[model samples]
Target: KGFEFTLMVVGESGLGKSTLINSLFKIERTVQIEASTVEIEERGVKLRLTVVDTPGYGDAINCRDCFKTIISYIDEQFERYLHDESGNRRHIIDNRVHCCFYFISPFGHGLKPLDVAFMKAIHNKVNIVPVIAKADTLTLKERERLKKRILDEIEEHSIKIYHLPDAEEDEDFKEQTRLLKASIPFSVVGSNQLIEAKGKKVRGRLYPWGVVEVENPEHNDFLKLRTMLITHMQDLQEVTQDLHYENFRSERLK
Candidate 1:
């Protein structure tokens, strides 16, 4: 059986989750509890990538129990995996989500009460990678300040987010790891539109004053987020299996 990598995107409406997925995976489609599967080959290894997008989240008022649905879904996957394991199934499809992209509103200085509640509900059950959505709206200084503020709030609330593993002895890898770690809660900008910028067609936004490139590292953390997702793919899967799934399995048995 080939490697199965499952990712879920959780955010409020109009955070450009669909646009980011489209830009990252080059797949343009509407999402509604959507599961899109793609076969990817990299470095002679094949991977079956499943991306789950939940739209219409946080759209309703009195969003107290909104996170319960997502938590139940995650637990259901773990239960299925446990059942398959108990039955000695060799070809168990790994539908368990490895990571969730929890989007934070860029307009806010830090985490909102709703954001904290949602994250705390599912933080222990799955790996939550918080993201700053629509990061292009903020200037560089503002983004930096907001990131610090968010990090402080996360620590203050004792939130458990996905931690990036250390890099190997390779200098380049170490440098990359440093950059990625420094960009916790990756601030990102996503755009499905392709615009011309100085004779080059790119996926970005074109304003009368300037252009915002989606993949530009200097512009936002889109590149870093994509890199972390791909580079640390196996690590995420391992955490889900060894930590999250194991915890679920233990609790079910108890």
Candidate 2:
């Protein structure tokens, strides 16, 4: 009747990570290590939803500590899980992070120097899904240019982010899988303001010219990320177990 999921967000502050989190859960943070759990019931199904955010690295010079602290947190979860396996247990709480949403800057020249270290180190340990934060700031063509540059950077070491899956399903559904794969570095912008709409009040950003609605596919790729995430929530956990956690334990034992 119920289950749980853990999501982690990594990025320098001001990337709209907080806003994006709110944009996803329809509800609900800190400098130190923190994971806040929200009890959510969707369509009569209850679930424990937890999110871990790596804050405090904002405008700090010692960039070294950021990733190390983050990595330690990820490692600690696995360490605890491994220890728990040796005990007589009925149900052990799984705190291992299932997926990490790594936010990239929209203003920088694609993948910046700071981004390289975090991406390379964490990519191997978790399902690192990259998003170009603050998408509303860039024109679509500008976004196009930046996506290629970042995509090219991830190619060097063959950095593996989240691999979205597919099937020979309906043509409409089939095309979505292809597009999500092609749509790397998913562009995203989250809105705090609820603008008045024709039928309902929805989350959207307003400018003098027009508005960029949160769920509008034409506005940005925000909705697509949620669609990809919600549809693959179980896949994320399986991949975490079959791929990432297995590698962690193998390396630890070896």
Largest lDDT belongs to which candidate?
Answer: 1
Model 2 misses residue 43 by how many Å?
A: 12
* Cα shift from native, residue 24, model 1 (Å): 1.3
Cα RMSD (Å) per model? Answer: 2.5, 2.8
lDDT of 1 by residue, 109-209 (tens): 59988888888988999899999999989888899898999999999999999999994468888888988999887999998788987788998888889
- lDDT (10s digit) by residue, model 2, range 156-225: 7577888887893578888888998888788998977798867888888888898888898887898789
lDDT of 2 at 8: 94
- Please report the candidate that would top TM-score against the real structure: 1
Q: What residue pairs clash in candidate 1, if any at all?
A: none
For model 2, the superposed segments whose C-alpha errors exceed 4 Å read: 26-29, 40-46, 56-58, 168-170
List per-prediction Cα lDDT, in the order shown: 0.85, 0.83
By summed lDDT, the worst window of 10 consecutive residues in model 1 runs over: 56-65
Alpha-carbon TM-score of each model against the true structure: 0.92, 0.89
